[PDB]
Amino acid sequence: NFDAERDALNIETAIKTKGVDEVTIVNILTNRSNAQRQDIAFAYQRRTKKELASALKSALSGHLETVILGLLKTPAQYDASELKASMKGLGTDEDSLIEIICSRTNQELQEINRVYKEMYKTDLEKDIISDTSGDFRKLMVALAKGRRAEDGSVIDYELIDQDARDLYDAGVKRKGTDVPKWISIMTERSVPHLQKVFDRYKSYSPYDMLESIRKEVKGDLENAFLNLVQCIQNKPLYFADRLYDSMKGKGTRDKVLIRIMVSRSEVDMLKIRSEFKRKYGKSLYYYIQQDTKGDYQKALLYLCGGDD
Ligand SMILES: O=C(O)C1=C[C@H](O)[C@@H](OS(=O)(=O)O)[C@H](O[C@H]2[C@H](O)[C@@H](NS(=O)(=O)O)[C@@H](O[C@H]3[C@H](O)[C@@H](OS(=O)(=O)O)[C@H](O[C@H]4[C@H](O)[C@@H](NS(=O)(=O)O)[C@@H](O)O[C@@H]4COS(=O)(=O)O)O[C@H]3C(=O)O)O[C@@H]2COS(=O)(=O)O)O1
Ligand SMILES: [Ca+2]
Ligand SMILES: [Ca+2]
Ligand SMILES: [Ca+2]
Ligand SMILES: [Ca+2]
Ligand SMILES: [Ca+2]
């Protein structure tokens, strides 16, 4: 059914139409997989001898341009470019750096590290170091390696219990905090293993893992731990909460809204939508529809995949 040559032709016609036909551009690109969009990009240059990304940057503008250009990048290229943006200058946008690093899998991070190095001619780890400090740096650097332990054939309940007590001994139980212990356990163990550790943790601590973080640490280190634990406990819900935060109240934090819709549209959007509706009462579709307008809105609603 998919025809890259046909799509590229229709996009070119839309770009050259007087005033630019954004609707057609959105209708096509937001209804094609990332892989198909790559095929469309090669077909476009093959036909016009011009790069699609460049053509669209000139033809589009505002939030819509941001969405479209983001969709044209491969998953790794997009994440790599988003990370670079968060660390730009004094990289004061720690929240974006945290979101990406705390949610990507070993496989995703392996490709991100590779592409980041190819695109910016520098190791992702070095830029992270420059935009982080203290234990916050140690945690982010560790996570970015994407070297989380694999899932064993058999569940190690003895270790699960061990880690749970260690987490407790390292924080709430003692004066101060043994941050390195928290970092080692939360970055080295597999996600599934940690989901069980956090459950078992409730048997030793009167505060769950999240509340324990709020009482033990502060600042970016605290926020990084909060994002990590949330994502480990329930990734779809984590993104649903970040999305809600990006639209609640006056205005919109477009940087977050666009990045999540673009990066998770083909990953777990169905689960994100379900968690969103369950917690916020309204559908994600409804929130997007109410916080944005025009072609930009249309594009995001297509990435949403539907109403709930
Ligand atoms: O939640 C609010 O912050 C908010 C809600 C209320 O609706 C209203 O509050 S009230 O007390 O006045 O009653 C007020 O509305 C805001 C709106 O929230 C702002 N959006 S934000 O910038 O994202 O924070 C903003 O909206 C204007 C923006 O330029 C833009 O909004 S959005 O689509 O990004 O959400 C939109 O402008 C274009 C839009 O970019 C185009 N998109 S396309 O992809 O190119 O097709 C397209 O949709 O057209 C619109 C409108 O174009 S026009 O304005 O040139 O005709 O909408 C803008 C707008 O509606 O003004 O500002 C409004 C109004 O706030 S103000 O203080 O009265 O100026 O706040
Ligand atoms: Ca137009
Ligand atoms: Ca432009
Ligand atoms: Ca303590
Ligand atoms: Ca809003
Ligand atoms: Ca808005």
Tell me the CATH number for domain 1-73.
1.10.220.10
Cβ proximity of 80 and 119 under 8 Å: yes
Continuous H helices in the chain:
4-16, 22-29, 34-48, 52-59, 62-72, 75-87, 94-103, 106-120, 124-130, 134-144, 157-170, 179-188, 191-201, 209-216, 219-233, 235-247, 254-264, 269-280, 284-291, 294-304
Which CATH architecture group holds 74-153? Orthogonal Bundle (1.10)
Domain 154-234 annotated CATH 2.60.120.10: no
Ligand 1: which atom is nearest the Cα of residue 249? 1
Resolution of the experimental model, in Å, one decimal: 1.9
Q: Which of 288, 293, 301 to mutate to test the pocket of ligand 1 (most atoms within 8 A of CB)?
A: 293
Q: Examine domains 1-73 and 154-234 and report if their fold is the same.
A: yes
Name the residue among 34, 41, 33, 35 with its Cα closest to residue 7. Answer: 41
Ligand 1 touching residue 21 (CB < 6 A): no
Query: Do 276 and 283 form a contact (C-beta atoms < 8 A)?
Result: yes
Q: How was this one solved?
A: X-ray
**CA distances to 148, 177, 256, 284 from 278, in Å:** 30, 35, 21, 10
Closest CA to 191 of 80, 104, 279: 104
At residue 175, φ and ψ (nearest 5 deg) are: -70, 140
Spatial separation of the C-alpha atoms in residues 303 and 259, rounded to whole Å? 11
Domain 235-308 - what CATH class? mainly alpha
| Residue reference for tokens 């190095």 | 117
DSSP state of 305: T
